Structure formats: structure tokens, C-alpha cells
């Protein structure tokens, strides 16, 4: 594998598809840097991990806590996560999954702040990143950044339109950071329903008829386990010719 | 023979360029025209010839409102006032948006929390709040249409600038969000190529030749885009009643070399 | 004023359904108009039916001709006459091809050789066909415009119609192709969605009744399309100059339900 | 570690090129690998290639058959053979097909009926066969798949490959009917961009100098793609048990600029 010794960063690596990512690359053996706001189960996510990979050097699974939904120090955040990721190094590979977690209010209530403040963690954190990467990656095709939209940007869910609008230009600005960041390679994993701890919380008690629903809306019968998703960063990582583009991991959802 | 004639249509952005060819063509079929603008002057010279063009139709269905929806304070109540001039005693038929601020983005190494926000507030947030009012001034049948505004950089951005495409990205998911939101309502985009507005005349100053020259040779025609023919596919979805969550594409083949 | 009151448009496909549709609205704007069909009886009534919705114009402007081109040994002779009359003394200024076999294929469990590759000739060969022979009788200028036909079952097929599926996404990228072999010719694409034409209650027979419920429920709008509007989406193309290797979406938001 | 390993893989068209890598890439992870090819000495040829650059493999993991899919007779009975020999006594797990008779196609000038068709028996005929006769040699499960091949220039077509460029156009719109009609196993498509395989030599001859040139400039990377990167696309179909349905485009950014 030529991602033994690469050094991954994962913003919002901390639980469901981002830790998925780092499982998979601790798999290969690379280094990998662990990006969330919650300091608990940061703990508890970076700990868990070296207990499913304890022959991994412990020193190469590294955890900060940053908050990314906030204006002030987002800047400041992934500057100080890319310095911590690069190290002596530079970073071969950057994953970002970090998204707020929150159901939005419905249209006739929508307020001017509601529309803006996704925007700061799903467009300006990756720009941040974009920003400052040349100082700590190598512009070449064989390092990746790999953002992280889905499905909904095509089927959106019903309530979800502003934040079903973000994950339209989180696809439309990768296109734009492969020629920005040339030749460096930028693309989009576009998963489809994928059962996370997080989609638990959100849906509540409305959940398991929200489950049914997914799995029928599959040409698999089935909705997606979070380490095969993981498989499409992991591609990505591995192809030094895909740039630019959309993996699009659904279950054929789009065809029914 | 015209659906259009009785009808009304809203232009947030028509006082030059794109959204001005969009009132002209309107007019053309006989609607009666609402324009938004922010520039209190050329608002009246878009507004003077088009009653000078067609004075065929009636003074009062031409009729305008300075709205600046660059700032977020001012932008829920500037789009209420401009549909409820839109609608009047009827409701209204048809919403056109072309707004936007056409000012150059800084490059990414000096990229700033407030230059890539405040894009949006036009962008964005101006759609959303003409979703979030249009109910009460239009029926929401299959017979109405809101049409958005997208790119051809939406797929080929230009360098750099990224930050834009990303919005128009999102014009586009939103869009189809929104038709269903205010189903059975129909909402679209069109996404325009190379068209000579007179903003793009201002915004590339002295490399205006060496633009337009490599614009017409990236395009199957060997010319750029008409703002006459341009405005066509808002007409076209406008009398599409089956036409919604699409994205109607006129950039003379410019994706294609 | 109109643009389209002098322009020759040939149909292919032009005696039922949609493409009959777009005869209709083509002779709303004043074309002249040159149907192609294969059944002479739905071809002269056709041509009858036009001549009771429009009793003004004048009888030249509604002529038709016979045309299998489901033949591999005839389909480019066909193709060549019915180019030639069309242009008549002067060139033809559109072409829109509609023409397809609407007939059940067979199930995967009968597949055949043959059962795949027929449906080519229509679909594929005489596109092909159209091109290859239309440049003595079009300017391929940016004003003239060639438009060939697609589906929403290209990207949300119909069990089991896998193989025209196929066909369609076909049809789509060698109009995209032929963009650039024709340029600056204009060539796009229309992809409708759910039209009740007189074909598709043939193939759905008993089944008719539950499969409109079920397309409309399956749609953001409360509807299926209208023939008339979804030949919108022709005229227009035949209106902008810049729309070229494009598809044009007609589908009730179907693809977002 | 691998879940591959004790995994089936018939590599439909991997004698030469992509199809190549991808059984170069299945052998480094265990896999048993059945090549089809239609030359006798390719295949053998590289069936001797792939164990000595894996002298460890057990011989019976690298089987060979040769099969022509050109033809119309035959192809049905010798996709039959393919898939009795890829399952043995289990069944297949995985199925690629790369096939194409990569030879330039006729200008429009000469095109015919034949020369349009033809390219379909191995472009739809053979993997609509395999998807016919898959069911009795394979589970129809979410861990198995079927991936076709398309390409960027369904997109961005190359002159004179228009007709080409349609039938990739079909194999994208036919794996997603087949994403269906084989539910739930997964069916997928992968989209290269610019790969220099020998064959493409043989295309360009003296020109390949001078379009490997404007190929590296058209991307965003400045290379052409590597068979060994393009293959981890196949690759990770094998690793996604929820892919389905999808285009996995790997082109290098051309279509950026
Ligand atoms: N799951 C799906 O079906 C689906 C579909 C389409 C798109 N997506 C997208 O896939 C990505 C991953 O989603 P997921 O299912 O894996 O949910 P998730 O488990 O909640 O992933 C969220 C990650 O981002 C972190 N995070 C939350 N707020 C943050 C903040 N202000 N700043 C920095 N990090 C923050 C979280 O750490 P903390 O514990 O500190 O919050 C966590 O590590 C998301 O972008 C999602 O929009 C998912
Ligand atoms: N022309 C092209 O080649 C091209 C290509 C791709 C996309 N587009 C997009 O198509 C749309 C039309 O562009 P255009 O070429 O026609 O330029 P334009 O002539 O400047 O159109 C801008 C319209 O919106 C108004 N406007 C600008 N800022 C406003 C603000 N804060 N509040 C309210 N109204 C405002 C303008 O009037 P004021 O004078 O008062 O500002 C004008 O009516 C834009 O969205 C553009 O991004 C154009
Ligand atoms: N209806 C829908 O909902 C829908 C949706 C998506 C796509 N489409 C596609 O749109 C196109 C029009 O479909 P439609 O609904 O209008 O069905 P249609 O009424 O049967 O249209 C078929 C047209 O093509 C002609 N035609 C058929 N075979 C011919 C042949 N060998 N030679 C010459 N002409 C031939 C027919 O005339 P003859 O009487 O001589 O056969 C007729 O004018 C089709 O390609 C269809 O697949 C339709
Ligand atoms: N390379 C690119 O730039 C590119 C771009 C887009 C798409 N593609 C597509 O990728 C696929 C792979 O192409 P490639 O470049 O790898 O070319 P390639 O090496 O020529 O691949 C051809 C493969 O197909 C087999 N084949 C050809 N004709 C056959 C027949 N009648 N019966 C059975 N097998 C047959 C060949 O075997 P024999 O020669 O043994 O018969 C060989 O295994 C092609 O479909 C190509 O169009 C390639
Ligand atoms: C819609 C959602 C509530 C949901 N409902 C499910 C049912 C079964 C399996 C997964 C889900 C999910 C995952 C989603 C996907 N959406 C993409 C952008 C916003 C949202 C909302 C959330 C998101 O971030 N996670
Ligand atoms: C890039 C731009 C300066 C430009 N350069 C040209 C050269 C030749 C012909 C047309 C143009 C245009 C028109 C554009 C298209 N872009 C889409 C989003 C931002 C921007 C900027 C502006 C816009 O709104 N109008
Ligand atoms: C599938 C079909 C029988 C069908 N079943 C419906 C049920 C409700 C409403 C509309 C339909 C239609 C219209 C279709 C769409 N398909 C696209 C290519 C072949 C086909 C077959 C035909 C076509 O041309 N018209
Ligand atoms: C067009 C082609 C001759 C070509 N010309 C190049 C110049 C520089 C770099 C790469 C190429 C290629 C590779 C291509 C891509 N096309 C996709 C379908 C048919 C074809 C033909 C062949 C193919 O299979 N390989």
C-alpha cells in the first residue's frame, strides 16, 4: 500500500462516516489526525481506536478539538489542525465530514441567520482548509482533499432544502479547488442513508419508520453500513487520477 | 393566444442585462412587468424605454421598486414590498431572479470569513425569502413558475472564482428543494453561458477583448450569448406548465470543448 | 416580429403524440411545416387535423411524407427525401426527431440479438442519418437547430425497458457528438417525463388507469404532461440561439420524488 | 484482512489495457481471475504476464477463455461459457467488462447503417447477456457487482467519436435499468478519462506524441491516467457494498478546463 506512510487528516473524524474513514485508513497503517468539537468522546473516539489497532505506534492517532461552526477562530482552528496534521511532514490526504447536526426551522419561520449559519462549517472551514494547505501539502496528484456532500443535493429531503442547497455548493466548490489547487486533487463522496449515532439523534422517535422508508427506497434492500462509505475516500486516496469529481455511494436510491 | 397576456411576473434583478431581456420578452407576450433594482436612476432608463419599445401596453403595467437586498437587515421586508407591488389585486404568475452583485471575489490566499458569506445574502437568502412569502401572492398551481438564476461555471468554474460557483451550486440544489417545498408550485433554474451585460463590460475592463475572444472560441457557435436569446428559457419555463426542477442550460455548447 | 413565421421545420415523428404537438405549435408561430410518418393513414389525418385548427394558413405550409425508418435498406434514402422536400426551393431552418417504435420490448428471460439492435435503426441510424445528409439542405448557422428526443427513464428507467433506456442515454451523448460535428449548428436534446399520449395507453392497456395515479402521485406537481407543453420545450429551443449540446427537462419534478 | 480474497472476479475484456490492471490489482488481493478475450496469443500471453509478476498465486487462480464478442451468433453461448468457467463450482462475485473493439470509426461522410450498428453487440449486446444469464452463476446479493465502462467522452465527445460516444451513453443509462432489473445486486459504471494503453497507441500512431501533449494540458493534474489508478475504481466497486446506480468518473479534471 502506498498509503502506509501517508498522513490523513480527518475533520470530523470523531463519529460516524469521518471515524469510519479513519478506521479504514488505520487499516493501511497510515497516520492519522482526528478533528472534532466535542472533547469527551474525542477521547473516546481516539481511544477506541488504538484498541482496535493496538499494534498501530499510539503517536500516530492524534485528536484536537476545534470548533468549526463558530466565525472567529475557524481560521485560526484549521490553521492550528493543519499544523498539528502536517507536522514535520506534510499532509498527504485531508477528509472532511464535519457537519452541524441540526434540523433546520420550517420555510415559513426561516430567518436571515438560519439561511447563513450552516454556511460557516459546510463552505467556509473547507475554504479555510483550501487556504491554507499549500503550507502544509504538496501540490501534487498523489495528495487528495476530499469533501463530503450526498444524494439530498438531488433528492432533497422535505424541511432540508437550505442545508440540501449547501451540499450543492460544497460540489460546485470542489470543481472550483481542483483548478484552484491544481494539481492537486479535490473530489466529493455523495452518500445516500447511512444510519450514524448522529442520524439516531436527529430523527428520535420518528426513526425506525424513517429507517424503513430508507431501505425501501434502495435497490439494495438496505440502508448503508458506515465502513463501506468509507471505501469512496478511501478510493480517492488511492486513485492519483481522480480529481474533480462526484463518488456517489446511495444504493441506487436515485433509481426509485 | 398568449398565456402570458393577463399575467404578472416579478424580475428581482431586471434593470439591466439578463433580467432586462426577461421584461422586454415578457412585455413582447403582453404581461405586465414588476422590476427590482438597487440603482435608483437607471431604473427609470430601464423603466423609461420599455414603454418607449411598447407603448402599446398600458403605463401601469409597467412598474418598479428599488430594493437593495445586499444586506441582511432590509431583505425580508424589500421582498415583501416588492411582491405585494408584484401582486397587487391579483396574485402573481410568474418570479424571475437575476440579482446578483457582480463585484470581483479576492483570490483564496487572501480569502476572508466575510467575503465568502456575503455572497449568499443576494444569493441565497433573497430566494429564500421570496419562498418564504410568495403563498400569500400566488397561487400555488402548476400554472406558476419561479425561476432561479445559475451558471455554466456551475460545472466549469472559472478561475478563481470558486466562492460563486459554490452559490450558484447551491442555487441549483435549492431550486429543486424548493419544488418541493411549494409544490405543486413550479420552481427552475436557468443556467446562462457568455452574455455581453453591460456588468460584464464593467467587471473585466481592459481584459474585455481578450475575454470575449476566448469566450466565443470556447463555444461550439462561434459567438457568445444574446441577452434576447437568453431570456427565452425563462419564457420557455414560464409556458412549460410540466416543466419543474430542471435546470435549463443555454451556454452555446461552451461545456462541450 | 416573429422569428419563427418564416422558418421551415421538419418534424420527424410529426403524426402522433408529441411530435404532433410541436407541428401545432410550430404552425402557432407560422412555420412551415414537413411531417414524416410511417402510417399513411396517421399522416393524413395529421395533416387533416391541422387544416380544421388552422384554417388560415396556407395549404403549403402543411405538407407531409411517408417515411419508414425502421428499415435498414430504405432508412437513409427516406431520410434524404424527406430532407429535400422540406427545404424546397429555399433550406430548412429545424428538424426535430420524435420517432420511436413504442412497443413493449421483450423480458430479459427472452432477450435476443435482434431485440436489441432493431430499436437502433430509428433511434440511432436515422439521427445519424439526418446528420449526415442535412448540410446541402441547412445552413448550419447558430439560428438553425437540430433536436432529438430523451426521457426521464434515462436516468429513472421504467422496469423492463432497461435496453430503450439505453437507447435514450444514447441519444443524448451523440447529440452532444454531434454539436461539434455539426457546429455551429445547434444540436439539444428534449427529455420528458410523463406524457398520456395515444402510444402510451396502447402499452399500458388495462394497467392504464393505475399507472396515471401512480405517475401522478409520483410527481411534484399534481400532474402528467400536457402535449402542448411539453412542446414547449422544441419551441424554444428553436428560439435561442445559444442553447446548444443541452438537454431541456420536462418531468413535473419527478425525478425529485 | 482482505475481502477479496477468497473472491470470484471474471474480468470480461482483461487481455489488454484497463481490464488488465483491473486483474492486476484483483491478484494483489487474492482473487480468482478469469480473463476473456478474443485473441488467442493476448490471452495466454497475458495469462503469463500475471504469474510471474505473481509467482506466489496458486496457477488455477489465473484462468483464461477466449470469446468473441463481435459477432452475433455465438455471443449469447460464449458469455454462457464465461460465466460457467468464472463460477466453476461457486458462484462469481464480481464481474468487469472493459470490451470494445477500439477501432476509429468512418467519417459522417461515410457512415453507414452497419458501421453504427456493429459496435453494439459488444457495446449492449454481451453485458445485456451477461445480465441475462448472470442470475444462475451469481447471488443476486448487495456483495456482488457488476461495473460497465463509459467514459468522459460521453461528455466531452472527441471527433470524429460521436457514435462511440453515444454507445457509452447507453452502456450508463442501461447499468442503471440493470441496477434494477438485478436488484439487489449492485450494477455500476466507470467513466476514464485519457489512459494510454497500447491500444490507444495504435489509434493515434504518429499523432500520439502531440495528443498526449494537448491530453496532459486538458487536465488539471498535468498527466494522462495511470491503468493502475483507473483500475482502483473497479477496485472499489468490489468495496462498496452500497454503490449502486453510480457513475465513478476518473478523468484527471479534464472536464474543469
Ligand atoms: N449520514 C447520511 O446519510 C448523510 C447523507 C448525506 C450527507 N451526509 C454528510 O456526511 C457527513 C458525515 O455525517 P455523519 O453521518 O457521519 O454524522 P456525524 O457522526 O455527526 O459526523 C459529524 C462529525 O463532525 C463533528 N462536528 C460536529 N459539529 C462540529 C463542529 N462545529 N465543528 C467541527 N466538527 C463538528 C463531529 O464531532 P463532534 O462530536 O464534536 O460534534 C463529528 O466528528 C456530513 O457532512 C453529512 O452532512 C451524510
Ligand atoms: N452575463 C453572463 O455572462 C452570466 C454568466 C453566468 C451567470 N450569470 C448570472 O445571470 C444573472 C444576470 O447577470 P447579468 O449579466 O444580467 O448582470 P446585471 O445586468 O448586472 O444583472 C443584475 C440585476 O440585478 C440588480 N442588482 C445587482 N445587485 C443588486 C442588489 N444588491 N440588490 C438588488 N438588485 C441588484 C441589478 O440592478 P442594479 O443596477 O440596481 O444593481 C440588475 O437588475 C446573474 O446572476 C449572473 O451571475 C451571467
Ligand atoms: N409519451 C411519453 O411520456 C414520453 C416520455 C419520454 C420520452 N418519450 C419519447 O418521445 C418520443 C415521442 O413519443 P410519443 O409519446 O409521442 O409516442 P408516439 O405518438 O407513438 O410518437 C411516435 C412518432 O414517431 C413516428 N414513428 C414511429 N415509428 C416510425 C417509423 N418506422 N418510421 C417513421 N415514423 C415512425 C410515429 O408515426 P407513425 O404513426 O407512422 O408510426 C409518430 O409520429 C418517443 O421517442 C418517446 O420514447 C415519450
Ligand atoms: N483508455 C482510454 O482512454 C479510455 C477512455 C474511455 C474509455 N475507455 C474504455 O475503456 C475500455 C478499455 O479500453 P482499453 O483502453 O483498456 O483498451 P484495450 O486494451 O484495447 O481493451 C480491449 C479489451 O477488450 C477485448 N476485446 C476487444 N474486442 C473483443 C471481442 N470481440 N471479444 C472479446 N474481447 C474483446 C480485448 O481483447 P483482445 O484484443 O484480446 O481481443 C481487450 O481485453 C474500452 O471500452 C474503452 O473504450 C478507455
Ligand atoms: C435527512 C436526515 C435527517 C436523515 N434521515 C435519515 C434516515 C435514514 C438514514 C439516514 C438519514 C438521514 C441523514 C441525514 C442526511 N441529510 C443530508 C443533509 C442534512 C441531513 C439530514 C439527515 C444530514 O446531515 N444527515
Ligand atoms: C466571470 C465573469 C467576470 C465573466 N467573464 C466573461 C468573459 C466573457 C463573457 C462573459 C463573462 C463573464 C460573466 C460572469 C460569469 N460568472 C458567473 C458567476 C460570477 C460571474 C462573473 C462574470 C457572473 O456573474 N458573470
Ligand atoms: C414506460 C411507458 C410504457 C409508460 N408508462 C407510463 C405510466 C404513466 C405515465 C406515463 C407512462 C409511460 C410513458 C413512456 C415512457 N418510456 C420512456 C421510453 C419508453 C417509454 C415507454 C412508456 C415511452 O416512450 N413513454
Ligand atoms: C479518442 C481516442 C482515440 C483518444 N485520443 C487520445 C489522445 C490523448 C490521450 C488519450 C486519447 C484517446 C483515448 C480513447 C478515448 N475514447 C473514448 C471512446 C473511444 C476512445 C478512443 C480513444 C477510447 O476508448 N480511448
Redesign the pocket.
Known sequence: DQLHGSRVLVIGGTSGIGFAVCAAALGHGAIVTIVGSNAQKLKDSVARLKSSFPSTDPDDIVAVRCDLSNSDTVEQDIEKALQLAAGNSKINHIVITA?D?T?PPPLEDLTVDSVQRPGIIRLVAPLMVAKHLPKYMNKCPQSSLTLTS?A?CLRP?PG?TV??GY?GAVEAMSRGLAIDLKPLRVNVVAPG???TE??KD??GDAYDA??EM?EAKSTVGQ?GSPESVAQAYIYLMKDHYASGSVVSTNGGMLLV
Open positions: 457537519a447536526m434540523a450526498g439530498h429531503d432540508w442545508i440540501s451540499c442513508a447511512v444510519l448522529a442520524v436527529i430523527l424513517a429507517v430508507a440502508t
